[model samples]
Target: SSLDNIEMAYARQIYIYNEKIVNGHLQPNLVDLCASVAELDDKSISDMWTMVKQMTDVLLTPATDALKNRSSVEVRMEFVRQALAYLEQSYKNYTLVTVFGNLHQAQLGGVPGTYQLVRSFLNIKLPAPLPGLQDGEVEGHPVWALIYYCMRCGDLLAASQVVNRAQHQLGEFKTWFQEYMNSKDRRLSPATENKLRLHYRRALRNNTDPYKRAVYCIIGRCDVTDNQSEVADKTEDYLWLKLNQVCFDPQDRLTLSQFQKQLLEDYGESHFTVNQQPFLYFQVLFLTAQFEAAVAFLFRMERLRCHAVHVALVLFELKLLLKSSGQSAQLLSHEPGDPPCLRRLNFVRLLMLYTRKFESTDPREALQYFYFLRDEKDSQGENMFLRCVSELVIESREFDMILGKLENDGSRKPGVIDKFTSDTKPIINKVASVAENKGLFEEAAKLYDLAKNADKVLELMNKLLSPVVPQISAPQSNKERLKNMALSIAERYRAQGISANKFVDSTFYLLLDLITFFDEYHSGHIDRAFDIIERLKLVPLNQESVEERVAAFRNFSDEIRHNLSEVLLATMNILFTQFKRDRDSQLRSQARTLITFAGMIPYRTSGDTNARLVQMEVLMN
Candidate 1:
């Protein structure tokens, strides 16, 4: 026989799959009967029944035996809650008559056909049939009632119904699903639930809907959809009433149940597919609130006000456009053809209304909303943030808000030394390249000094250094001293890792060249000091030998006896390009230090300067 005809049997098995499907079709009249006997307003009885069933299922889980053995007063109270919610959703769905009949038969005789079969299997005596309910009499239900009797009576003539079905839907006892999943009245509190579970068990004991008992296992916990668990073992006359608004001509408008409505609302504009269209109904609900209306508009117009990043930019752009004439652009967008400009414009209007409404009522709080208008996303914003922060120093500004914007904007470096190191290298390299192309070797060497990359310094030095046949400067007395000093400095430089290997042997002649250059310049052999400067620029530097740098500087010093403006300017730019404002402060100081010594050097020295000092006021000045 079809399980539906087997009243309790069909429901028993169906509850494993879908409780509502079995109950609504197989036994429609049972809920009212349960309400009458239990003295419950339909809602209250169902509420309790749902909880009781849930607690029973909890007891059946693998952990249940352990929990019961270990049950403290606290743990018992938790069990009470799970039972209560299951009983509650169940009690409302079934009647007292069906509940009492099903439980009694199961407790006492078991169902006739399945009764003998189950008792042998379990090897236990069944309890008495419940008092108020009668034994099996088939209602107008189409299939044989024998199976119903057997299933409800715990008389399994057939195999056990899938108990795992109930377990799957209900989940475990303490799980969050037990509390929230498909709960009609979500009173999940433990204390209140204990009381409800106790009452639900009472209603089931009386001749109530047996469907109510199983409903706890079935409908109490269900999937998001009703059909998700339904099995097709039974088909019968189902009751339905189709009513229209006109009540005259039938127009096909599917009525949305509460579950479907919630599904629609949650799934609105999401990736989820639904059975029906809810746009119009949703629009009515959405228009009730400004936020809702705005969300609906964004969703419908394909301009999703969804991502945090996009909304942040939107607010920022709105504020800018409202406050200034400046045009703005969004870097990324989900929309095409210039990024949904009109839709965004409408959003700005809605936001403006919000801002104006809240600005005075909570000025400080309202101000944060306007921050969305600030564009902290682009490089121009970064530069602007920096310039704005420098005003902290310029105008003694103390606002961290604007300064914070700069810090996040990435304009600043880690610390002051990194700033100097980072800025100096580029400026010096560019200037040195310019000077080299112009044959300004002195200017280039000073730049090389500021950069301090010995490789590039040595590289430029190699190119700048010129070789010539040694001009014995009328064969002077200082020749041995110059040659020995240059060669020793060259050896020290090589040992220090500054490679001047190509020019090491030429060191002596280069020193002699330098001596002659000075001699010629002083005796009116050359008018400008640069030839002296250019030849001096070729000297390689080595930090390990201070003697090397000093000796070279001393030789060059003897040659120029004074720095010209070109050399001074190039060196200043190289060393302090990053500190342009501070350059002037150190400029005159350097000039004074260099020129004070230069002032004492004569236009013509008789021999080495280890002798008396002679001042050249005109040349140094």
Candidate 2:
């Protein structure tokens, strides 16, 4: 009967695989063609495959439905219990047992008691499935799946036990299982590696017992240190591990305050246990939501007394709290008695938390947080956190800060710097375009500078600095804001050491003239303003035809007639000097004739009437 059911299951998989082949979604070579279930006797696998399918649906569906229905924790726990009840009914099926274990694993969050249930299934000694089944049948009966399931659910010691069992299997699956057990970097793709990493991280987060955590960390490659290896006997290591276990285990069921009350009764209220133990009392306090107490404990810890990892771990917990609570993480100001290292630690912690929570939605705020943490130091002197901050910096368009960070040790280490530069370059032009369109011309140009595009920098400067007239009502035209923007363009160009060619010089002088003209005109200095306007005409604009250049200058003067009309007589006096110097007699005669016409205009100033008369006589002659 089991053989018949196994054959039917194999047929079902083969049917699906054939459909995939027909649909061109799978290659024929990649499909396993052998009917591997034929390797086993019918009696051995009797009803096993069918029962596994039945129990998997029964167990998996309710947990999923419970979530969808928003069932209470008790109702979800009952569903988990209902799933685990099938374990006894399908005891003979190793495949069903593994499936049952997975169901319980999924229930760990909703049912705390499921932790014990998962451990029990992990410890159960199931007979190994028959060897060399070439079909996908073994895929369901995967002995290694149980080991991985233990790993996924944070049962590290149990996973180790399964590894030990498979070590002696001597079957065809033995080599494959051994390889999976030994190789740490089995997953080559980054997506798989990241998924595995997240799984281990969650395992550690959900587990309250440190002994289990220590084993999981060992497998996950995050355990603290191997100092215990110095001693042949692991007695001290075991003792410390148990101490961590005792300290942390209460957190799963009882509040940290209650645990502390019990702890103080035995050991008295002293910081010694927390300072020296791997228990992470700070996290314990944090998990219980006793943030103020945790913060106070952090304040009291001397720089020499705590491990950097311990400090970072506490900060990460607080970060999670702040994120989940939807509150801003604020750093307490350094007190007079606070250690410098501790003070900086709190500051970095606060910033790191804020950056993590708001990176995608509010990158500007995240960037500000990074700036605050830029100078921070930890015990290891590692720039790891700062390296992480660099990614957000690029996303936030805080390119200047990114360059500053890259210029330090990152310049010596070419890898991260190159990556940072490469990733940010593609967006520089796009962001600059947006900024330019928003009338943020200076910022757009600065973005070009950060991208090291000197040509684009000059192009933007030329575009924004072109002499244009302001409408009488439009403050945006020749307003203080526009003047400041022109000055910023000039400053960035000079600061970037752009070559001083004719166009560069012309743009710079024109921008400066505009800035001076606006300042004087705004202050009602008509004479001083006219003096700057005269300087603007001498600047050679871009590579335009002579006629176009003349038209540009005429437009420039014509556009500001209302503002410059009173100062036109002074411009005529300046032009009179050009009439004598121009070697082109035709142009010289025209300037002389314009001077004669300007001599008929009246002087506006009483203080300079005689000087105006003297200039008028020279122009008339």
Q: Which regions of candidate 1 fall more than 4 Å away from where they truly are? A: 1-330, 335-452, 458-497, 500-516, 519-621
User: Model 1, range 481-533, lDDT digits (tens) per residue?
Assistant: 44443344345445554553344334433544554554454344332333453
- For model 1, the run of ten residues with the poorest summed lDDT: 237-246
Clash count in backbone of candidate 2: 4
Q: Which residue runs of candidate 2 sit more than 4 Å off their true CA positions?
A: 1-257, 260-296, 304-401, 404-448, 451-589, 592-620
User: After aligning candidate 2 to the native by TM-score, how far in Å is the CA of 378 from where it should be?
Assistant: 24
lDDT of each: 0.32, 0.40
Q: What TM-score would every model get versus the actual structure? A: 0.19, 0.29
Task: Give lDDT tens digits, candidate 2, residues 1-621.
Answer: 222343344434444444454356843311122124423434323232232223222222332431232223333233222222333233323323454566455455443332344444445533454343211222233344354344434344555565455554424333433444565322123344345446656754444333333433333333333322321133223222222222111112322234334433354325435457422454333222233344545545443122222233223322311111111234443334432211222445544543454466544333333432333445556343355554564455555534332231113223322332335554455556567677776677666655656566665665554434222214555544555554654555566565445555555455556556655665556567656864655322122233343345444422132323334344444444445542445434434443333333322342354356346546544
Top-TM-score candidate index: 2
